[PDB]
Design a protein around this nucleic acid. Structure first.
Ligand code: K
Ligand code: K
Ligand code: K
Ligand code: K
Ligand code: K
Ligand code: K
Ligand code: K
Ligand code: K
Ligand code: K
Ligand code: K
Ligand code: MG
Ligand code: MG
Length: 1316
RNA sequence: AUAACUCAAUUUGUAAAAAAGUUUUAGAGCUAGAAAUAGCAAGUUAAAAUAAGGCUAGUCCGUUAUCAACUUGAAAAAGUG
DNA sequence: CAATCTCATTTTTTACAAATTGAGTTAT
DNA sequence: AAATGAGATTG
């Protein structure tokens, strides 16, 4: 009747337990339903729910967005064919028909098999003339002869079907012609500005060096290499870098203490440059114009590779170039191999599986695997010297459709499209009339802020229609309301003001919002001088002066400025003490200065009659990021500023939204005062009151006005939490588990509920170092190349994050010496349990940090500080890591800070865990007392994993996860015991552990020793522990430790695997070649995979038991069957719509509809000798038994795998090994039934008896994946690998016992499937 | 424990785009020889599909979340030891 | 039939909002 | 980025 619940919440598991007064877990009889022998069964109230991980919405999103791209790319083609339809009907009757049936085999085609012209002779002639589609592109662009309308279409459709990216705004007009003159012009102006010293043009071939196919870095090096007395870091070097598209830094050139780095493709270039030019003088302007002018002709040299005077199609020409070089070097490679390597010619040019040229063209061999495979052959032969040059440039034998085309801007494909239309519109009138439309098909792009063009049936769409019409690319601006749509894009996601829920939050950069932040900070600033007795607030007149003089002149306001530029200058204090702010004010009037630079009118920003306009301008600048719409929205104010000011305001853009509403900060008014919140922050007289105070002061009316403005389900609520969907899945299951236990306990609520919650990309790592190293100017990657997969090594990863340098000592490290170095916790592990890179460092020896009990010492901080700064700016360390490193210069860890960490080790602060406790508390405590305050009948306790974990080590209740899943349940039992014991012993700690509403050393010691009441001797305490005030019993060393052992020793624990209908993709995505088989699924209704190939390995949503008849033999005599049919995800909707018809089509007859049993994945069946199986599929099974190993063996394995008194227990009881093997064998021979594997285990074990007991025990732990629950898996015992033994027949299940389990497993209905 | 602000890191969710990959077909293979089979010539490109499909017919929707059994329900979830 | 081997779509860009953690300032 | 449900091939 009196019980508490323990809960262990994980991403894949929820353990649960029920305990009584004396920490015993009850044992109850439960009714068994079904048609079986048993009418009931006894179960212990300890168990654990297992389940597959909850997934994010990401993959579904990526598939959904890809979906929409494919359909819109198709609509592009359709739009184009609709423009061509009438005039093509006169040239070729069925052209567009042959194109769309091009995929069909000749047997299924309506028209002749050759798509373009419809006859061998003309089709063979076409490929002779245009071996690639780019041969046709170029000719159609450059030639002036009338072209076949079918060839015009193909050219435009190819350009429209693959249009390139949209990452560059505006238009490009390739000009590769003037690089030599433009470079000479840059060197020219530079030498005009630096007359003391010039650069020499020197006939340097800039075109070749800068247009060569290397990275921008190399082309820079080669360029300055040809310049004597110059360096790549020097001014001219950093200019060449910018002209190449790089981001250089110019501060060290001009003696600037402020970083000046420019990127010509970044939208902030013009203003960044303005800052630089305002600092260094505008006589340097022409120097950057030359860099930009050279940048325009060199921009796309990466892709063009051709002079733009021969053609208007430098891309296609570049493509044709790839082809011709592929041709020559292929002829040349063939000859060579014949002469010098004839015996290898077959492998290279014929065998499709070898990654040769045949594998390259006809196989699945990528450019990289081809090059890798043919690298030795070339450098082995002679006469191949230039092919190796082409290979290192990745230019050897190149296709035209390649992974690296992603750099091509759509503006290029547009150029060629435009040219083709210009030539042939002379001959075809309709191409003239529709020249606009066609270009628009390639050009148009749904703006990301419009979203899907739905009509009321899209859960993802927000866009609004300016008129009810079909949206096309040509009527988009007129039919779609872009302004209202761009608004909803933001507003459907923005927060309302929690204080005023009917009001939108202000932009973060709103002038009003920043006045609020400055005053709210200023109003609690206090000051003292010599004369005065107390520190005093700032008055109204003082703040206004501080704002007008400092905040409206300085971007940031330092305390030094406050003391010198206000207190000294205006109040004549040689010295003053400031409280309430440190070093400088956090708040600032940034937008005030942003606009001051643009509108150059200070009296405009200070004029209060402009407040509304300025607030609407900054709202516009935040809501919209499309500068074409910003301009349209600022037009109304175009009369208040000149043209150039509006131009600048266009580009001013903000992001972010505040926490509060305009009405809250200003709108609302105090009835007595008539002042708004901001009025009080400006002037409140003597008491200078916070926003917090203003909102909670019962003397003012703000609180009541707010309070009267305020205003679901378990599943929606949990889904709306912030956190991993995986952990949310466990949260929901935890509530459902508790509901059932309460019901099991007769609807009596627990006394306590104790809950505990548990806590990979190499590409990101490689990206981190590449960026930081590049930003750091270090050669460590050229000197010590790396591969992402290597960086999963902890020490190697740090080594590169620290630029191959000791983090504490200022000396190099040796990659070959990592094993001799130390990983060290910045803030010692004994305080903060932090495993991440943020708290870790690689140093030669951990002794050099300093004292072990603290942050790295002052000495080290001094020596290394500047070096950590560089790592910070290179983003190789985070601010968190940096601030921790330096803390010693702030006194290191104070005694208070230490005590803080130790209690954070046992007291849970995580928000997600607090939500779990609040959910439980609100479901358990629903009643209110006579004073209308909540009655807390159930106390919800939350514990960190450390308490039970330490409890296990201390008292040797050891845990080994690999043996079975019982530990999930044991942890929950131990949570309830410990959690109830603590609150029973220290009822004052209710505030810390229970949900609801000099000394530092004592705090440290106290929390550090909190768990000693369990022990008899601490390095003494009575055998019977009790609480002081009540005298009640909490812990009894005599009987209670034994009860825990009895519980952890129980063989029967309810480990339930949640059955789940499988969802997601229909099958694997790969499209297999045609095959004579019924395994392949058609990719389209009429595409028989025997002809067209298709998908394999469909996914079973659930299995169904069918008992029915099937026809057999020539005569179709009916045989009675009972079998498992897998319903695939794709078939499921049809099956549930009409189950009989579905099964009848499948061949089953006279189906017994009332015996149809739906069997999701992991359905449980028992067989002979308690042997169990779980349904993995319609044709596979998983292991359904848990092996309960005696505690004595579990504790042994733990101690053997890893004081003198426990080492002796290992040797004394060494015979346990053979007994553990015995235990596994009987289990295996009884439930696993893998005969061969069990031998190789017994054989592989017999052979390593000679090995140490440690290693032997370490690998016996491996042996348990043979007996573990669920899917079989391979494992290694020393160097012997055991292959997994799958169970790929489900026949035996059909006569076994089906077990339907409730969430706890306590309620079962068992069906004996001996029915026919 | 809460609230606003500062700096930073992380996580979740959404939209708009790009390049490949795959699959069938089209790129008249040629001499020999009855036949397999040999010898050589070739290869780089394109079309089309890219969850089967759905009705609400939109340039929309189709892979997340949620699911023991029985009784009740569209469903959520409730009722049953 | 088992045993044994084999295989699994990938990558890139832009724009945006909300939590949460954790070092700070001020407050209820 | 596994791992785990199948496919084909073998014994
Ligand atoms: K035909
Ligand atoms: K290939
Ligand atoms: K291709
Ligand atoms: K500060
Ligand atoms: K914006
Ligand atoms: K004007
Ligand atoms: K699901
Ligand atoms: K799934
Ligand atoms: K994101
Ligand atoms: K279940
Ligand atoms: Mg489709
Ligand atoms: Mg392709």
């Amino acid at each position: 009747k009196k019980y508490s619940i323990g809960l262990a919440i994980g991403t894949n598991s929820v353990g649960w337990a029920v305990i009584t007064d004396e920490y015993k877990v009850p044992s109850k009889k439960f009714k068994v339903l079904g048609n079986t022998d048993r009418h009931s069964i006894k179960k212990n109230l300890i168990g654990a729910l297992l389940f597959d991980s909850g997934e994010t919405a990401e993959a579904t999103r990526l598939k959904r967005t890809a979906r929409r791209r494919y359909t819109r790319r198709k609509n592009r083609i359709c739009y184009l064919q609709e423009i061509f339809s009438n005039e093509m009907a006169k040239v070729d009757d069925s052209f567009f028909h042959r194109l769309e049936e091009s995929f069909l085999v000749e047997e299924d085609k309506k028209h002749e098999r050759h798509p373009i012209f419809g006859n061998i002779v003309d089709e063979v002639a076409y490929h002779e003339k245009y071996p690639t589609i780019y041969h046709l592109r170029k000719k159609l662009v450059d030639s002036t002869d009338k072209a076949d309308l079918r060839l015009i279409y193909l050219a435009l459709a190819h350009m429209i079907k693959f249009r390139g990216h949209f990452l560059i705004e505006g238009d490009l007009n390739p000009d590769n012609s003037d690089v030599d003159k433009l470079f000479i012009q840059l060197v020219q102006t530079y030498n005009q500005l630096f007359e003391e010293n010039p650069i020499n043009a020197s006939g340097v071939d800039a075109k070749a060096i800068l247009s060569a196919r290397l990275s921008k870095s190399r082309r820079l090096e080669n360029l300055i290499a040809q310049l004597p007395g110059e360096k790549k870091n020097g001014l001219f070097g950093n200019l060449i870098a910018l002209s190449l598209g790089l981001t250089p830094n110019f501060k060290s050139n001009f003696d600037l203490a402020e970083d000046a780095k420019l990127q010509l493709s970044k939208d902030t270039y013009d203003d960044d440059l303005d800052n630089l030019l305002a600092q260094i003088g505008d006589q340097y302007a022409d120097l950057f114009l030359a860099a930009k002018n050279l940048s325009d002709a060199i921009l796309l040299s990466d892709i063009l590779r051709v002079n733009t005077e021969i053609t208007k199609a430098p891309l296609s020409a570049s493509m044709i170039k790839r082809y011709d070089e592929h041709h020559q070097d292929l002829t040349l490679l063939k000859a060579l191999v014949r002469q010098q390597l004839p015996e290898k010619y077959k492998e290279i040019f014929f065998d499709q599986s070898k990654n040769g040229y045949a594998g390259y063209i006809d196989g699945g061999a990528s450019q990289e695997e081809f090059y890798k495979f043919i690298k030795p052959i070339l450098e082995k032969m002679d006469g191949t010297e230039e092919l190796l040059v082409k290979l290192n440039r990745e230019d050897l034998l190149r296709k035209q459709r390649t992974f690296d085309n992603g750099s091509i801007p759509h503006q290029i494909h547009l150029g060629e499209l435009h040219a083709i239309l210009r030539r042939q519109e002379d001959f075809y009138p309709f191409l003239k009339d529709n020249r606009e439309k066609i270009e628009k098909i390639l050009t148009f792009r749904i703006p990301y802020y419009v979203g899907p063009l739905a009509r009321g049936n899209s859960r993802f769409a927000w866009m609004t229609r300016k008129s009810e019409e079909t949206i096309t690319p040509w009527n988009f601006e007129e039919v779609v309301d872009k302004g209202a749509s761009a608004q909803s894009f933001i507003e459907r996601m923005t927060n309302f003001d929690k204080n005023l829920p009917n009001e939108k939050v202000l932009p973060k950069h709103s002038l009003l919002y920043e006045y609020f932040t400055v005053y709210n900070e200023l109003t609690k600033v206090k000051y003292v001088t010599e004369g005065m007795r107390k520190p005093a607030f700032l008055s109204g007149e003082q703040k206004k002066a501080i704002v007008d003089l400092l905040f409206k002149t300085n971007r940031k306001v330092t305390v030094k400025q406050l003391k010198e530029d206000y207190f000294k200058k205006i109040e004549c204090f040689d010295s003053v003490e400031i409280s309430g702010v440190e070093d400088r004010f956090n708040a600032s009037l940034g937008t005030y200065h942003d606009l001051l630079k643009i509108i150059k009118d200070k009296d405009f920003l200070d004029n209060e009659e402009n407040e509304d306009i300025l607030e609407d301008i900054v709202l516009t600048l935040t809501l919209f990021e499309d500068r074409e719409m910003i301009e349209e929205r600022l037009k109304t104010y175009a009369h208040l500023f000149d043209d150039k000011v509006m131009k600048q305001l266009k580009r001013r853009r903000y992001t972010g939204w505040g926490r509060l509403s305009r009405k809250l900060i200003n709108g609302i008014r105090d009835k007595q005062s008539g002042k708004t919140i901001l009025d009080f922050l400006k002037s409140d007289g003597f008491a200078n009151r916070n926003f917090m105070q203003l909102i909670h002061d019962d003397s003012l009316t703000f609180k009541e006005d707010i309070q009267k403005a305020q205003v679901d389900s378990l599943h929606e609520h949990i889904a709306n939490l912030a956190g991993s969907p995986a952990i949310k899945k466990g949260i929901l299951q935890t509530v459902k588990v508790v509901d059932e236990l309460v019901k099991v306990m007769g609807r009596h609520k627990p006394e306590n509920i104790v809950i505990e919650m548990a806590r990979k990309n190499s590409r990101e790592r490689m990206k981190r170092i590449e960026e930081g190293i590049k930003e750091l100017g270090s050669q460590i990657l050229k000197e010590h190349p790396v591969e992402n997969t290597q960086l999963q090594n902890e020490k190697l990863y740090l080594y590169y994050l620290q630029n191959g340098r000791d983090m504490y000592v200022d000396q190099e490290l040796d990659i070959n010496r990592l094993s001799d170095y130390d990983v060290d916790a910045i803030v010692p592990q004994s305080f903060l349990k932090d495993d991440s890179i943020d708290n870790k460092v690689l140093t030669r020896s951990d002794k050099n940090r300093g004292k072990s009990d603290n942050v790295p010492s002052e000495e080290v901080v001094k020596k290394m500080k500047n070096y950590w700064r560089q790592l910070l700016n290179a983003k190789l360390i985070t601010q968190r890591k940096f601030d921790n490193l330096t803390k010693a210069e702030r006194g290191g860890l104070s005694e208070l800070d230490k005590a803080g960490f130790i209690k954070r080790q046992l007291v849970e602060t995580r928000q997600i865990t607090k939500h779990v406790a609040q959910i439980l508390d609100s479901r358990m405590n629903t009643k209110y007392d006579e004073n209308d305050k909540l009655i807390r009948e159930v106390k919800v306790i939350t514990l960190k994993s450390k308490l039970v974990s330490d409890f296990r080590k201390d008292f040797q209740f050891y845990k080994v996860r690999e043996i079975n899943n019982y530990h999930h349940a044991h942890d929950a039992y131990l949570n309830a015991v410990v959690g109830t014991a603590l609150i029973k012993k220290y009822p004052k700690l209710e505030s810390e552990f229970v949900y609801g509403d000099g000394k530092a050393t004592a705090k440290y010691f106290f929390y550090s020793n909190i768990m000693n009441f369990f022990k008899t001797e601490i390095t003494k305490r009575p055998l019977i522990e009790t609480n002081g005030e009540t005298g009640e019993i909490v812990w009894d060393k005599g009987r209670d430790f034994a009860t825990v052992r009895k519980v952890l020793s129980m063989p029967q624990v309810n480990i339930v695997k949640k059955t789940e209908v499988q969802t997601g993709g229909f099958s694997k995505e790969s499209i297999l070649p045609k095959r004579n088989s019924d395994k392949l699924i058609a990719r389209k209704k009429d595409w028989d995979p025997k002809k067209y190939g298709g998908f394999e390995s469909p996914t079973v949503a659930y299995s169904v038991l069918v008992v029915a008849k099937v026809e057999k033999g020539k005569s179709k005599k009916l045989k009675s069957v009972k079998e498992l049919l897998g319903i695939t995800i794709m078939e499921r909707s049809s099956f549930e719509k009409n189950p009989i018809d579905f099964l009848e089509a499948k061949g089953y007859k006279e189906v017994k509809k009332d015996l149809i049993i739906k069997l999701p994945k992991y359905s449980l069946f028992e067989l002979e000798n308690g042997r169990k199986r779980m349904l993995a599929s319609a044709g596979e099974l998983q292991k359904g038994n848990e092996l309960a190993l005696p505690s004595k063996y579990v504790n042994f394995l733990y101690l053997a795998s890893h004081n003198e008194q426990k080492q002796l227990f290992v040797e004394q009881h060494k015979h346990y090994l053979d007994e553990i093997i015995e235990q596994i064998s009987e289990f295996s021979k009884r439930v696993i039934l893998a005969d061969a594997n069990l031998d190789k285990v017994l054989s592989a074990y017999n052979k390593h008896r000679d090995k140490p007991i440690r290693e032997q025990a370490e690998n016996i732990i491996h042996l348990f994946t043979l007996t573990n629950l669920g899917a079989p898996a391979a494992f290694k015992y020393f160097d012997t690998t055991i292959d997994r033994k799958q169970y790929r027949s489900t026949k035996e299940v059909l006569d076994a016992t089906l077990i339907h389990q409730s969430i706890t497993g306590l309620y079962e209905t068992r069906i004996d499937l001996s029915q026919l």
